[PDB]
Design a protein around this ligand. Structure first.
Ligand SMILES: C[SH](C)CCC(=O)O
Length: 360
C-alpha cells in the first residue's frame, strides 16, 4: 500500500523525491506519493475531525511539530528505536546534530529565510543589508513578504536596529525583545513599508512565489527560502541572495496518527528510510539545504562538488556556511507555537487595515 507524504512543492518537493523519496519507494516496495501544501495544520485537523485521514507523513514547520504533538495529531517517536543509526553505528539521537523540539519531530534539513533581488532589473545600486530591504528611498518599489507574521517580525526588528544573537544556548536573544512593545514596533515597521507609496507589499504563500515575482519584475526585493532562490539561480535566473539577518530554521517530518499506513507500519518504514544518512545527504545534491545528520553533512563535504552536475560545490550555498551566518537569527519555534494566535490577530488586523485605507 502507498504512503502519502505532504510537502511544500516546487524545488523542495523535487529535492525530496529525487534525493530520498523515489529511492525509498524502490528499496522498500512501498510506493511514496507526494501532495503539495503551504504549511500549518488546518488541513490535517479537518481530515482528523472528519475521520477521513489520507495523509501519512507531513513535512512541517518546527512550530507545528510542537503544536501537532500537543494536539495529538502526530506520533510520539522512540527516537533511537524508530530512526536509523549512522553507518558507523552512532545512534540517531547522537547523529542528528541537536535535540528535537518535540517528541513528534524527526529532522530532515535546515533552511534559511533570507531575501533576494534580480541583478538584471534592480539597477546600478545593489541591496546588501536587511535595512536596504526596508529603504524605499534608496530602493523604491514593491516588496514581497511572507503572508504570516512569523519571520517578518524578526527581520523588521533587526532592520530597526534591535540586536539578534544568532544561535546560542537558550535560543536567539531576539525573542526576549519580542514582547508586546517589540511586537508593536515590528508591526508598525511592516505597516510603514506596505503603506509607503514608494514601497508596497505582495504577500507570498508558496515557496515558489518569491523567485517568480523577482524573475518577472513584479517586486524589487522578495523575502523567501534560500533553496528556492538557489534553484532559480541554477536555472539561469540572475537573482542575488542577501544573507544579512537571514533566519536559520530547522525542518522536520512528523508521522500522522491513524493515516492509511499508520497501523500497518508502512509509513514508519518509509519515514525511517527517508531520514537515513544516505537519504538526507542525497537531497542536498538537488537543493541548498543542509542535512540534519552529522554523518550526512560529512558525506556531502567529502563528496564535493556535491551538486547533481558533479561540478558545483554545495557547501558555500548552505544555510550553515560561516559566510552565510555572519548576522543570522536563529528561529525560535516555541515562541511561535506559544504565541502565534495572539500575534496573528494583530497581524491580520494590520493587513486588513492596509486594504481599508487603500484607495483604488
Ligand atoms: C519546507 S519550507 C518551510 C522551507 C524550504 C522550502 O520549501 O524551500
Amino acid at each position: 500500500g502507498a504512503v502519502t507524504v505532504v510537502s511544500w512543492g516546487g524545488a523542495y518537493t523535487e529535492s525530496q523525491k529525487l534525493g530520498y523519496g523515489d529511492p525509498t519507494a524502490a528499496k522498500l516496495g512501498i510506493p511514496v506519493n507526494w501532495v503539495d501544501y503551504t504549511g500549518g495544520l488546518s488541513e490535517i485537523k479537518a481530515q482528523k475531525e472528519a475521520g477521513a485521514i489520507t495523509w501519512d507523513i507531513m513535512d512541517v514547520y518546527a512550530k507545528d511539530t510542537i503544536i501537532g504533538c500537543d494536539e495529538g495529531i502526530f506520533h510520539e517517536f522512540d527516537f533511537d528505536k524508530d530512526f536509523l543509526p549512522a553507518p558507523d553505528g552512532t545512534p540517531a539521537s547522537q547523529d542528528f546534530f541537536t535535540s528535537m523540539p518535540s517528541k513528534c519531530a524527526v529532522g530532515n534539513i535546515l533552511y534559511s529565510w533570507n531575501f533576494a533581488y534580480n541583478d538584471a532589473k534592480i539597477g546600478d545600486k545593489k541591496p546588501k543589508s536587511i535595512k536596504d530591504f526596508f529603504n524605499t528611498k534608496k530602493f523604491p518599489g514593491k516588496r514581497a513578504i511572507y503572508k504570516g507574521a512569523m519571520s517578518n517580525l524578526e527581520i523588521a526588528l533587526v532592520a530597526d536596529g534591535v540586536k539578534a544573537s544568532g544561535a546560542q544556548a537558550g535560543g536567539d536573544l531576539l525573542y526576549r525583545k519580542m514582547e508586546g512593545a517589540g511586537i508593536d514596533r515590528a508591526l508598525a515597521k511592516i505597516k510603514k513599508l506596505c503603506t509607503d507609496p514608494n514601497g508596497g507589499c505582495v504577500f507570498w504563500n508558496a515557496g515558489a512565489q518569491p523567485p517568480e515575482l523577482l524573475a518577472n519584475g513584479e517586486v524589487v526585493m522578495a523575502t523567501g527560502w534560500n533553496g528556492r532562490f538557489f534553484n532559480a539561480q541554477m536555472e539561469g535566473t540572475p537573482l542575488v541572495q542577501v544573507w544579512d539577518a537571514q533566519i536559520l530554521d530547522y525542518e522536520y517530518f512528523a508521522l500522522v496518527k491513524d493515516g492509511p499506513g499508520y497501523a500497518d507500519g508502512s509509513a514508519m518504514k518509509v519515514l525511517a528510510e527517508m531520514t537515513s544518512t544516505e537519504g538526507l545527504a542525497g537531497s542536498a545534491k538537488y537543493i541548498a539545504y543542509a542535512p540534519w545528520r552529522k554523518s550526512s553533512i560529512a558525506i556531502m563535504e567529502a563528496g564535493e562538488p556535491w551538486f547533481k552536475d558533479g561540478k558545483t560545490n554545495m557547501v558555500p550555498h548552505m544555510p550553515t556556511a560561516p559566510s552565510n551566518l555572519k548576522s543570522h537569527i536563529l528561529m525560535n519555534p516555541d515562541y511561535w507555537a506559544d504565541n502565534q494566535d495572539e500575534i496573528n490577530e494583530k497581524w491580520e488586523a494590520m493587513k486588513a487595515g492596509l486594504h481599508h485605507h487603500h484607495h483604488h
